[PDB]
């Protein structure tokens, strides 16, 4: 169940409301200000790292289940999503539908969106690829 959720469900959830559009109306106050701007943020593909922990001093290193238990930490991995940011603007001629046009401002980039706890012996866990000998090395019970 967890493998299915991590592999497919996470991508599906983001692809539901990935798009946010903010509309800046004409705000007719003078003829020199009659341009309407449209700013849109779009979420692309999501990426998941291996389990890791960030310390107070700011050093980040891979975390193993054995270390997590002793230090009262959380066994979790980071979530990153590619974000595509665009903005459209058009001339708001009175009494006519507007034609939003790309204004040569499109930036792309990974943004942290939180830590997802990782269940042990999962596809994203460190112990899935560990053999019997490897598990003994990491101080884990087969």
């Amino acid at each position: 169940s967890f493998n299915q959720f991590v592999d497919y469900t996470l991508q599906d959830i983001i692809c539901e409301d990935s798009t946010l559009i903010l509309e800046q109306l004409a705000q007719h106050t003078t003829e020199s200000d009659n341009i309407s701007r449209k700013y849109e943020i779009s979420f692309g593909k999501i990426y998941v790292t291996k389990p890791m922990v960030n310390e107070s001093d700011g050093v980040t290193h891979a975390l193993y289940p054995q270390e997590a238990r002793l230090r009262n930490l959380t066994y979790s991995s980071g979530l990153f999503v590619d974000v595509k940011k665009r903005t459209y603007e058009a001339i708001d001629v009175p009494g006519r539908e507007l034609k939003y046009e790309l204004i040569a401002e499109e930036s792309e980039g990974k943004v942290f969106i939180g830590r997802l706890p990782i269940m042990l012996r999962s596809k994203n866990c460190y112990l899935s690829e560990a053999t019997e000998s490897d598990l003994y090395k990491l101080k884990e019970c087969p």
Binding site: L20, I21, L22, E23, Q24, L25, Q27
Partner: peptide, 9 residues
């Protein structure tokens, strides 16, 4: 005057 900040679905 409008709200000058509107979100569209």
């Amino acid at each position: 005057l409008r709200r000058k900040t509107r979100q569209l679905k």
